[PDB]
A paper describes a structure:
The Ras proteins are master regulators of cell proliferation and survival that transduce growth stimuli emanating from cell-surface receptors to cytoplasmic kinases responsible for orchestrating a comprehensive cell division program. Here, we report our initial findings on an alternative approach, one that exploits directed evolution to discover miniproteins having extraordinarily high affinity for the most functionally relevant surface of Ras, the effector domain. High-resolution crystal structures demonstrate that the miniproteins bind Ras as a dimer and interact via a distinct binding mode that captures the Ras effector domain in an open conformational state, which can be stabilized by insertion of a proline at Asp-38 in Ras.
Lastly, we sought to identify a Ras mutant that would stabilize the protein in the “open” conformation trapped by our miniproteins. Upon inspection of the Ras-miniprotein structures, we hypothesized that the open state might be stabilized by destabilizing the intact β-sheet of the “closed” state via insertion of a proline into β-strand 2, thereby mimicking the strand displacement that occurs upon miniprotein binding. The effector domain of [name]([name]) exists in two conformational states that each possess distinct 31P NMR shifts for the γ-phosphate of the bound nucleotide, referred to as open or state 1, which cannot bind effector proteins, and closed or “state 2,” which is capable of binding effector proteins and possesses a larger upfield 31P shift. Whereas [name]([name]) exhibits a roughly 2:1 ratio of state 1:state 2, [name]([name],[name]) has no apparent state 2 population, and whereas [name]([name]) can bind both the 225 peptides and Raf RBD, [name]([name],[name]) can only bind the 225 peptides. In summary, these data indicate that the [name] mutant stabilizes Ras in the open conformation that is observed in our Ras-miniprotein crystal structures.
Author numbering: 1 to 165
The structure:
Amino acid sequence: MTEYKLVVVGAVGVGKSALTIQLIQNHFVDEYDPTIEPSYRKQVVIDGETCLLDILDTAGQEEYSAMRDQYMRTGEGFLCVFAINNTKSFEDIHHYREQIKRVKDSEDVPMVLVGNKCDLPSRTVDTKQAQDLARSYGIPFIETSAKTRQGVDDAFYTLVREIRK
Ligand SMILES: Nc1nc2c(ncn2[C@@H]2O[C@H](COP(=O)(O)OP(=O)(O)O)[C@@H](O)[C@H]2O)c(=O)[nH]1
């Protein structure tokens, strides 16, 4: 089966780790078990095809430029995550996309825009604003909640579909 190297990027606090843990372990913070050490290699079936997701989370190294570049060289596809209640995290998406294009030396890198924490009421980034940004980038946009699991599989699966294109 094919393996897909997926990298989760985005500002500190947007929920990169929470999203990955929902995909891998199927729960949120209340069910966090510190005795369990999960694997970020997961076998899944996407559109009837079985494959392996190999996930890298940049959490803790967001501001570590040399390591950011290593993630971007390695990754086949990128989840570009912001939080819908953090406009600065949305603005940071520009810088992540730019750096990915530069490290890859390409303008057509598999990428999905993810607006996380859509379960929260206090939104500061409109769904239409994120849709327009993704449109300008030529990439999909998905709203997610690591808390309710809304859109979590869809975000990762859609990224795999982008790589498959
Ligand atoms: N309500 C809500 N909280 C979230 C969601 N995703 C993450 N969080 C919370 O946001 C905080 C930061 O999440 P984390 O994954 O550690 O952020 P990061 O690794 O810095 O990107 C954590 O305390 C999470 O509980 C979400 O979808 N909904």
